[PDB]
Design a binder for this molecule. Structure first.
Ligand SMILES: NS(=O)(=O)c1ccc(C(=O)NCc2ccccc2)cc1
Ligand SMILES: [Hg+2]
Ligand SMILES: [Zn+2]
Length: 258
């Protein structure tokens, strides 16, 4: 019935209900490093997450989201290719069933184990609902994850997963600091795109960090034990919740470094 990542309702079927899937600025895309244009007029990114307020973690089928209180300018994103202030509303991951796949964006065709999306909306629009009606409504910060050493800042997330194993389940998740998930460098690529899951609205400025973070094998293993299904229903492991790379069409990927 509803969309999913299975053979019968996966990405290749999304176009039947969501015509925009075959639009002009769809995401994710493949980042060809030898073609990205170094743009010196790009300002440095300004991430202010010191006053962030996490509230809850939930399994909504598809993936698990950590939600923040965005009633005020608490955790914001400015600078880079952005014009205005963007508020953090939530973060989630996309991962695979094996370590060699899981990320949505690819670099020179290279797939990573997973990808973290920190979702923000443009404050000049009032609420997120109005923001998704504008070409510059959202800004998503994407971070790649590779299997290596453990990431301390991620463990608090890994520990609570058991309590939200099935669809619709949530758990209180306060006092989490998203700063613990950032790589050392803030160098990035950027291009105009869209949400990667239905309704696939093209209202996103994508900012993809060049430097990936490392997460241990055991940390990623716990992501893989979640369920797409709700309590009582037959078990379907939540793995490979990622959309394949889409054609770039008439867009240019700019780089803040060289
Ligand atoms: N993977 S990703 O960062 O691109 C992404 C970010 C946000 C959303 C979202 O808010 N969805 C709900 C929703 C419901 C109705 C209209 C718009 C969005 C979905 C995907
Ligand atoms: Hg829009
Ligand atoms: Zn996402």
């Amino acid at each position: 019935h509803h969309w999913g990542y299975g053979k019968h309702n996966g990405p290749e079927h999304w176009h039947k209900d969501f015509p925009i899937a075959k639009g002009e600025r769809q995401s994710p895309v493949d980042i060809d490093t030898h073609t990205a244009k170094y743009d010196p007029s790009l300002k440095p990114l300004s991430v202010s997450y010191d006053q962030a307020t996490s509230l809850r973690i939930l399994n909504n089928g598809h993936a698990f989201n950590v939600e923040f209180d965005d009633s005020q300018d608490k955790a914001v994103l400015k600078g880079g290719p952005l014009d205005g202030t963007y508020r953090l509303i939530q973060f989630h991951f996309h991962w695979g069933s094996l370590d060699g796949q899981g990320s949505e964006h690819t670099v020179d065709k290279k797939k990573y184990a997973a990808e973290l999306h920190l979702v923000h909306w443009n404050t000049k629009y009032g609420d997120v609902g109005k923001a998704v009606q504008q070409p510059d409504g959202l800004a998503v910060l994407g971070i790649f994850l590779k299997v290596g050493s453990a990431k301390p800042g991620l463990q608090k997330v890994v520990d609570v997963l058991d309590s939200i194993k099935t669809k619709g389940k949530s758990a209180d998740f306060t006092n989490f600091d998203p700063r613990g998930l950032l790589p050392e460098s803030l160098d990035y690529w950027t291009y105009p795109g869209s949400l990667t899951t239905p309704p696939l609205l093209e209202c996103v400025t994508w900012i993809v960090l060049k430097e990936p973070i490392s997460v241990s094998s055991e940390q990623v293993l716990k992501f893989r034990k979640l369920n797409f299904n709700g309590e009582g229903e037959p078990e379907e492991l939540m793995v490979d919740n990622w959309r394949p790379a889409q054609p770039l069409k008439n867009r240019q990927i700019k780089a803040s470094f060289k």
